[PDB]
Design a protein around this nucleic acid. Structure first.
Ligand SMILES: [K+]
Ligand SMILES: [K+]
Ligand SMILES: [K+]
Ligand SMILES: [K+]
Ligand SMILES: [Mg+2]
Ligand SMILES: [Mg+2]
Ligand SMILES: [Mg+2]
Ligand SMILES: [Mg+2]
Ligand SMILES: [Mg+2]
Ligand SMILES: [Mg+2]
Ligand SMILES: [Mg+2]
Ligand SMILES: [Mg+2]
Ligand SMILES: [Mg+2]
Ligand SMILES: [Mg+2]
Ligand SMILES: [Mg+2]
Ligand SMILES: [Mg+2]
Ligand SMILES: [Mg+2]
Ligand SMILES: [Mg+2]
Ligand SMILES: [Mg+2]
Ligand SMILES: [Mg+2]
Ligand SMILES: [Mg+2]
Ligand SMILES: [Mg+2]
Ligand SMILES: [Mg+2]
Ligand SMILES: [Mg+2]
Ligand SMILES: [Mg+2]
Ligand SMILES: [Mg+2]
Ligand SMILES: [Mg+2]
Ligand SMILES: [Mg+2]
Ligand SMILES: [Mg+2]
Ligand SMILES: [Mg+2]
Ligand SMILES: [Mg+2]
Ligand SMILES: [Mg+2]
Ligand SMILES: [Mg+2]
Ligand SMILES: [Mg+2]
Ligand SMILES: [Mg+2]
Ligand SMILES: [Mg+2]
Ligand SMILES: [Mg+2]
Ligand SMILES: [Mg+2]
Ligand SMILES: [Mg+2]
Ligand SMILES: [Mg+2]
Ligand SMILES: [Mg+2]
Ligand SMILES: [Mg+2]
Ligand SMILES: [Mg+2]
Ligand SMILES: [Mg+2]
Ligand SMILES: [Mg+2]
Ligand SMILES: [Mg+2]
Ligand SMILES: [Mg+2]
Ligand SMILES: [Mg+2]
Ligand SMILES: [Mg+2]
Ligand SMILES: [Mg+2]
Ligand SMILES: [Zn+2]
Lengths: 206, 60, 24, 80
RNA sequence: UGAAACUCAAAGGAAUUGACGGGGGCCCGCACAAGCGGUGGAGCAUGUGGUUUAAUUCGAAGCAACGCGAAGAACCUUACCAGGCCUUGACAUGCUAGGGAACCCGGGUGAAAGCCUGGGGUGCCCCGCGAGGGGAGCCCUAGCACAGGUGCUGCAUGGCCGUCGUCAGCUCGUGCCGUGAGGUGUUGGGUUAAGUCCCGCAACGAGCGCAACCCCCGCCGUUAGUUGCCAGCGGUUCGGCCGGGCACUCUAACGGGACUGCCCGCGAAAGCGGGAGGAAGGAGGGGACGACGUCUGGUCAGCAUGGCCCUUACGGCCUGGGCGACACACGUGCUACAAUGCCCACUACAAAGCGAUGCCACCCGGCAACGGGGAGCUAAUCGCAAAAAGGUGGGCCCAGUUCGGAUUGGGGUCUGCAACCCGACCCCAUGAAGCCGGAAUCGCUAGUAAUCGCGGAUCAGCCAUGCCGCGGUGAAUACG
């Protein structure tokens, strides 16, 4: 086991945080436990929308927030009937009373978190892994990207012996601290057990 | 984390002593950093996700 | 030496104060 | 180099059970789970069975032992 | 000359890619050597094996397990053990029912938990003149759907880590070679820390790695002054104290700066050897970063997860034990054995950090731990704060000794409901072994080793001598 998470490794440059709220040694642990409660629900439901990211800003009880999805509509609802229930679900969770914007993911095939989610689902439906991977790398590589890679864990195809399927194209320089590489990890329950899915997309350097 | 010993939230220890940090995310009771309420493991997991604001990778 | 409880350097090592090492 | 401070400690379980038991006089046996408590004057003559984690050892309290905790007469471990 | 019974699924040839050799040639790394200081010896601290135990919870096992998970075991934690008590439960989402609001406060009993058991109380919705009737929520039962399980599988797995390692290396696309595995590229000369670069080549290029892009330290410059100065001057309680000023030092953002560029020498080139400027050369010094893969490696006890198993107990609650046992063995450390030393005075010079239910200036009491009381600080303003080693002076004269502080007796202060098992800390006694450590064996190439002290996480307190960091002083040696 080697190699640091390419995001935690690139926070300095090519990659901003997912919560830009300041705090002091007395509340930080709370505002933190909160964000998690937030992402906890957001993901527990908005799964179908396909949520790549979820930023959370703050200034004082005016918890900005956002949610970058591939299919906004799923969030909104008929006119805005869903984005309503949820918007109240936030302040019912935390009597903070906060916003809840929505950014659209231009291409859901250049967001590693989705590409991962993608393959991860196929795996559960029993699609041939190698195919999915081969394909996935394509979807990513076709719609732009100077490089990409996908990794599935083991028990591939219900096998007893856990393996590790590969597949990757173009460049994916992890050692280069500037690559700007989106990384996405998707679990994948199954009748026989878990399978991990990692996704890497290299888009633009400098 | 034996979801039953996660009675730390009890707040009714009879004696404030028995009160013990314990992780908020894993239930991990042995490396809970006051400041984050997390255990050393998750503290490392989230920091990688950039979900812990300000928290970067130190180096010198 | 550093192990002599009731001595100068002894108190320092053990990070304490007392007759053999008062707080000025 | 013993210590406790100003306020000798003794659990009130047996206390109000002894000083009270002194009303009629003495009695046979007692049963405590307070190794914690200090042995005080008003116990001399009593026979307090102390728990050691598995047993309730019968400890006859005397003048010379007034001051020691009860646990000190109910040895925990068993060696050879 | 030359069988048979019985028996095997192979026996063989050539070539390929590897691994291997007590085969060869080049070449690296504190690998050896050269050094300097240590450890297996003592006492003690801590982890472990082994014994023991009602239990001494579990895992880790050559390197890469053994101050490891545990960055804090008195209860808690703890998963262990003994007892007392729960058993749709400590926590989820639901159910028909038998039926009584939620809630507030009690008293028996008990180690606590729990169990009886008795009471203030009884709102809300559509009905009803009312009486009172049927429901939402809620709680309490009684019976379900289930919860829960640090119970077994790390050889069923994610994830994450360690390891061979920052060691270079591992590959691909097309072309070319070969019936084929597969070769060529990546081999070869030169060079590099490097598959680094150069030159040459049936190969031309490319990907993951190397390097670079990020952080810290070293020199200079902008921008900025409740930290700095009296450098400059004038007030002085002669204290940067006050005026006043950003120069300086800092603080912290942004830039500059080094490219083998310049010079001489060698070379086909890359580059090597010097020389000059320069704070800094030829990766300035230290980090972050560890390819294709291997160990079928670690971890289901951090979490997640398939299967398996227990589901009045392999779940749950307490009180008390235990994880701290002790004939014995090992690892990692601490303090020492002393004069290049130990004391007591008195005096200097740090850097990074931490500080509300807190750092705690200062004052008083106490030999002291600490207790009273209180100034200032949400901290470049105040506090922890003394840095220690050093330096000046004085004592000890070489002795188990003014070395060394282990044991043990006594008296106390604190934290905590509570220190018997099983806490640090202070004071008086006591004053052990040890006079430098067998065979073995460990670290380190320079601000490194050695040595000196300071702060942090965890945390009430603490068994920190661990760990992660900080700065002071500052070597030896490397033929090869
Ligand atoms: K042969
Ligand atoms: K550098
Ligand atoms: K394995
Ligand atoms: K020393
Ligand atoms: Mg669990
Ligand atoms: Mg605690
Ligand atoms: Mg905490
Ligand atoms: Mg001495
Ligand atoms: Mg035959
Ligand atoms: Mg052949
Ligand atoms: Mg061969
Ligand atoms: Mg060979
Ligand atoms: Mg070397
Ligand atoms: Mg070296
Ligand atoms: Mg040597
Ligand atoms: Mg020894
Ligand atoms: Mg024994
Ligand atoms: Mg186990
Ligand atoms: Mg063990
Ligand atoms: Mg260690
Ligand atoms: Mg316990
Ligand atoms: Mg394994
Ligand atoms: Mg694994
Ligand atoms: Mg194992
Ligand atoms: Mg290298
Ligand atoms: Mg080819
Ligand atoms: Mg051919
Ligand atoms: Mg080849
Ligand atoms: Mg080939
Ligand atoms: Mg090769
Ligand atoms: Mg090849
Ligand atoms: Mg070759
Ligand atoms: Mg070479
Ligand atoms: Mg290269
Ligand atoms: Mg070539
Ligand atoms: Mg300057
Ligand atoms: Mg690198
Ligand atoms: Mg092993
Ligand atoms: Mg194994
Ligand atoms: Mg232990
Ligand atoms: Mg040792
Ligand atoms: Mg005084
Ligand atoms: Mg002797
Ligand atoms: Mg002596
Ligand atoms: Mg204790
Ligand atoms: Mg001597
Ligand atoms: Mg420290
Ligand atoms: Mg502490
Ligand atoms: Mg101890
Ligand atoms: Mg300590
Ligand atoms: Zn966690």
């Amino acid at each position: 086991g080697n190699k640091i998470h390419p995001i935690g490794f690139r926070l300095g440059i090519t990659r901003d945080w997912e919560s830009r709220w300041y705090a002091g040694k007395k509340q930080y642990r709370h505002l933190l436990l909160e964000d998690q409660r937030i992402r906890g629900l957001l993901e527990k439901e908005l799964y179908s929308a396909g949520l790549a990211r979820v930023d959370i800003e703050r200034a004082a009880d005016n918890v900005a927030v956002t949610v970058h999805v591939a299919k906004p509509g799923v969030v909104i609802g008929r006119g805005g009937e869903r984005i309503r229930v949820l918007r109240e679900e936030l302040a019912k969770l935390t009597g903070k009373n906060v916003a809840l914007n929505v950014q659209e993911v231009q291409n859901p095939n250049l967001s590693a978190p989705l590409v991962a989610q993608r393959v991860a689902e196929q795996i559960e439906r029993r699609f041939a892994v190698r195919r999915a991977i081969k394909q996935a790398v394509q979807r990513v590589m076709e719609s732009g990207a100077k490089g990409a890679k996908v990794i599935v864990s083991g028990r591939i195809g219900g096998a007893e012996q856990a393996r590790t399927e590969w597949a990757a194209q173009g460049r994916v320089p992890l050692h280069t601290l500037r690559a700007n590489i989106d990384y996405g990890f998707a679990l994948a329950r199954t009748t026989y057990g878990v399978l991990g899915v990692k996704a890497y997309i290299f888009l633009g350097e400098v | 984390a034996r979801k039953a010993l996660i009675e730390k939230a009890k707040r009714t220890p009879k004696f404030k002593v028995r009160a013990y940090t314990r992780c908020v995310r894993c239930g991990r009771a042995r490396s809970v950093y006051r400041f984050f309420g997390l255990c050393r493991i998750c503290l490392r997991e989230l920091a990688h996700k950039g979900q812990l604001p300000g928290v970067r990778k130190a180096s010198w | 030496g550093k192990g002599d409880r009731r001595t100068r350097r002894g108190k320092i090592w053990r990070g304490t104060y007392g007759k053999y090492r008062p707080r000025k | 180099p013993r210590s406790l401070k100003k306020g000798v400690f003794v659990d009130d379980h047996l206390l109000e059970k002894v000083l009270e038991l002194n009303a009629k006089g003495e009695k046979r046996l007692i049963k405590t789970w307070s190794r914690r408590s200090t042995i005080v004057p008003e116990m001399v003559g009593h026979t307090i069975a102390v728990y050691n984690g598995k047993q309730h050892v019968p400890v006859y309290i005397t003048e010379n032992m007034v001051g020691h905790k009860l646990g000190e007469f109910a040895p925990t471990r068993t060696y050879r």
